[PDB]
Amino acid sequence: AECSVDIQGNDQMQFNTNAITVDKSCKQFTVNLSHPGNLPKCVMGHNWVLSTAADMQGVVTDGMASGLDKDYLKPDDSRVIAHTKLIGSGEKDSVTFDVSKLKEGEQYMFFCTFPGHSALMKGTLTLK
Amino acid sequence: AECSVDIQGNDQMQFNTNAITVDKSCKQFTVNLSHPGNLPKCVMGHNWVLSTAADMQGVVTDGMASGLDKDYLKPDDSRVIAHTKLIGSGEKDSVTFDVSKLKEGEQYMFFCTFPGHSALMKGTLTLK
Amino acid sequence: AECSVDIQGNDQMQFNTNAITVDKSCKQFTVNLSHPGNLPKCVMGHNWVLSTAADMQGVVTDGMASGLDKDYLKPDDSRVIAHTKLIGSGEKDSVTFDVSKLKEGEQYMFFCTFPGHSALMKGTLTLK
Amino acid sequence: AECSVDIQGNDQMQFNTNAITVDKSCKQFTVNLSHPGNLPKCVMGHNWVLSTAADMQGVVTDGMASGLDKDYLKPDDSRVIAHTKLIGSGEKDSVTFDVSKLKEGEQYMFFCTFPGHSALMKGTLTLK
Ligand SMILES: [Cu+2]
Ligand SMILES: [Cu+2]
Ligand SMILES: [Cu+2]
Ligand SMILES: [Cu+2]
Numbered sequence: 001a002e003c004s005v006d007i008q009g010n011d012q013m014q015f016n017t018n019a020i021t022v023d024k025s026c027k028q029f030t031v032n033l034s035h036p037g038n039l040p041k042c043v044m045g046h047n048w049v050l051s052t053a054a055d056m057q058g059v060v061t062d063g064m065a066s067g068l069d070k071d072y073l074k075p076d077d078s079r080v081i082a083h084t085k086l087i088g089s090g091e092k093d094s095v096t097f098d099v100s101k102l103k104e105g106e107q108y109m110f111f112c113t114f115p116g117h118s119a120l121m122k123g124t125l126t127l128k
Numbered sequence: 129a130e131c132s133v134d135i136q137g138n139d140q141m142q143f144n145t146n147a148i149t150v151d152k153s154c155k156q157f158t159v160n161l162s163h164p165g166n167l168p169k170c171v172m173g174h175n176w177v178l179s180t181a182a183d184m185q186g187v188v189t190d191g192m193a194s195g196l197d198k199d200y201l202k203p204d205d206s207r208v209i210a211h212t213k214l215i216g217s218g219e220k221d222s223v224t225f226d227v228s229k230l231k232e233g234e235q236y237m238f239f240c241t242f243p244g245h246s247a248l249m250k251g252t253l254t255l256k
Numbered sequence: 257a258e259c260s261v262d263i264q265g266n267d268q269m270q271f272n273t274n275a276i277t278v279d280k281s282c283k284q285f286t287v288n289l290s291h292p293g294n295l296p297k298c299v300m301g302h303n304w305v306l307s308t309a310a311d312m313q314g315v316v317t318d319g320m321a322s323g324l325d326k327d328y329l330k331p332d333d334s335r336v337i338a339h340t341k342l343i344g345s346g347e348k349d350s351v352t353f354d355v356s357k358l359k360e361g362e363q364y365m366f367f368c369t370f371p372g373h374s375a376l377m378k379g380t381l382t383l384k
Numbered sequence: 385a386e387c388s389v390d391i392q393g394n395d396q397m398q399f400n401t402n403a404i405t406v407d408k409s410c411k412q413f414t415v416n417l418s419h420p421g422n423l424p425k426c427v428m429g430h431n432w433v434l435s436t437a438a439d440m441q442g443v444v445t446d447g448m449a450s451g452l453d454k455d456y457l458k459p460d461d462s463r464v465i466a467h468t469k470l471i472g473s474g475e476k477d478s479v480t481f482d483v484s485k486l487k488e489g490e491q492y493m494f495f496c497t498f499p500g501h502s503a504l505m506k507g508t509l510t511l512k
Contacts, residue, residue: 011140018422018474040324042298042344043140043248053475064244068296107476116141116244119171120424124474146267146294170426195453251294 003099004030009046009112009121011037011089018123020110022099030096031110033084041088046112047071048084048095050125053107055079056118063113072113086114102127132158137174137240137249139165139217146251148238150227158224159238161212169216174240175199176212176223178253181235183207184246191241200241214242230255259355260286265302265343265368265377267293274379276366278355286352287366289340297344302368303327304340304351306381309363311335312374319369328369342370358383387483388414393430393496393505395421395473402507404494406483414480415494417468425472430496431455432468432479434509437491439463440502447497456497470498486511 003026008016022029033048045068051059062074071086082097102108104127111122131154136144150157161176173196179187190202199214210225230236232255239250259282264272278285289304301324307315318330327342338353358364360383367378387410392400406413417432429452435443446458455470466481486492488511495506 013139013141039140040298042296043142064247109474115247116242119243120167122474124476168427170424197451197453248296 002026003028004032006032006034007048008034008036009044009087010035011039011044013044013117013120015112015121015123020123020125022102022125022127024099024104024127026099028096028098030094031082031084032092032094033087034092035087035089037089039089041086041091042068045072045086045088045114046117046121047073047086047093047114048110049073049113050081050083050097050108050110051079052081053109053124056109056111056122060111060113060118064115072115081108099127130154131156132160134160134162135176136162136164137176137215138163139167139172141172141245141248143240143249143251148251148253150230150253150255152227152232152255154227156224156226158222159210159212160220160222161215162220163215163217165217167217169214169219170196173200173214173216173242174245174249175201175214175242176238177201177241178209178211178225178236178238179207180209181237181252184237184239184250188239188241188246192243200243209236227255258282259284260288262288262290263304264290264292265304266291267295267300267345269300269373269376271302271368271377271379276379276381278358278381278383280355280360280383282355284352284354286350287338287340288348288350289343290348291343291345293345295345297342297347298324301328301342301344301370302373302377303329303342303349303370304366305329305369306337306339306353306364306366307335308337309365309380312365312367312378316367316369316374320371328371337364355383386410387412388416390416390418391432392418392420393432393471394419395423395428397428397501397504399496399505399507404507404509406486406509406511408483408488408511410483412480412482414478415466415468416476416478417471418476419471419473421473423473425470425475426452429456429470429472429498430501430505431457431470431498432494433457433497434465434467434481434492434494435463436465437493437508440493440495440506444495444497444502448499456499465492483511 063072084093084095108125111118191200212221212223236253319328340349340351364381447456468477468479492509
């Protein structure tokens with residue numbers, strides 16, 4: 001729609017898209033994450049995390065150490081522009097953030113920080 | 129069978145077993161690893177690494193640093209009692225080691241050193 | 257010891273005992289549950305739930321419906337005399353209850369409410 | 385624009401142009417590489433490497449041996465005038481170099497050092 005996107009994470013460890021475009025006219029953007037799979041949060045938990053291409057590796061590495069309890073995210077990680085919680089099969093979650101936090105020109109990557117998933121579950125977010 | 133076990137690592141990031149039992153009457157034990165998945169060594173490559181429960185973390189951390197070229201294994205890591213190579217979809221590999229290297233009473237863990245997989249891909253190997 | 261018992265739930269879906277005896281002289285009894293397995297709460301979680309033999313089936317069925325979030329227990333289930341929480345690999349939990357709640361002569365059963373586990377995970381708790 | 389060019393490498397293993405013209409009036413030149421594909425750095429990763437036509441074969445052959453960890457480029461290869469990183473699907477990267485390094489009259493070749501890609505991924509860079 002406008003200023004919002006519907007994204008899914010399945011048991012095949014994939015997002016149903018790898019490119020999100022945020023319209024500059026939007027004050028804020030909304031990401032709706034859903035898990036149409038069957039596997040529970042331990043095995044196939046997904047979340048949606050946004051940050052600069054430069055910070056991904058960092059977030060992913062620290063998230064893994066945080067553990068399942070912390071939704072595989074370092075508490076109050078400054079590198080994380082926005083994020084949903086870790087959801088499992090059948091669950092759902094959404095997050096809205098201020099388009100202002102994004103700065104035209106830079107590279108933005110979204111991905112799941114569940115151990116091993118960033119390998120396949122990642123994509124670019126562009127501010128056009 | 130006797131003195132050998134068949135183990136699999138799939139695209140869902142899991143081993144098809146988490147407990148292996150090595151009979152003391154065996155002079156050597158063989159582990160046959162196979163990858164019935166579809167994803168390439170890249171994203172979902174697996175391996176089977178054996179070590180003491182105490183050394184797991186150490187091995188996992190250093191392997192990650194060694195990189196995909198090194199099969200996510202520190203070259204000549206003394207803590208590794210035995211290991212297969214990193215295999216991808218459709219591939220296969222095996223490794224035989226001398227049961228003597230195992231000392232009854234201690235704790236042994238087997239796991240995959242591919243970045244993130246240890247979270248779920250790991251089990252206990254016991255000498256009975 | 258006296259007025260306390262140490263019980264375990266492993267990955268093989270089994271308790272390390274199927275009979276518990278509560279001495280009448282005890283004012284209260286304590287159960288210490290521990291999970292020596294490797295599998296996470298999703299797949300191989302366990303809890304220790306006590307009730308009359310007659311209510312077990314009822315508790316198990318409703319517990320299943322309550323879902324993982326509720327520790328596979330119907331909230332405020334009156335048929336439940338005592339219970340630990342659902343624990344996964346490496347975790348631990350304990351519960352102490354008043355021996356008074358038990359009434360000599362009746363039949364008591366303890367079991368795990370995680371889906372499918374009550375088939376093997378259950379035992380009798382006697383007041384001698 | 386002026387003193388910069390936008391180039392692409394897709395999943396079909398091709399550059400969106402095989403000729404780049406650098407204006408001598410430029411002090412330095414900028415190449416912006418983007419990967420509009422879907423395949424990961426792993427299978428369809430690309431990079432932009434500049435060198436004399438005479439050196440290409442050498443760079444490609446050694447870059448291949450360096451491995452994926454090295455971005456398929458021998459470390460500190462003197463034959464490489466300039467280069468971007470090895471990028472995957474959705475990623476992006478740029479490299480700026482001093483036009484001075486180029487010497488009018490000689491032949492310059494750009495290409496991707498990913499195993500096999502040089503067959504189709506290469507072009508000429510002229511200093512006019
Ligand atoms: Cu995920
Ligand atoms: Cu693996
Ligand atoms: Cu259980
Ligand atoms: Cu290429």
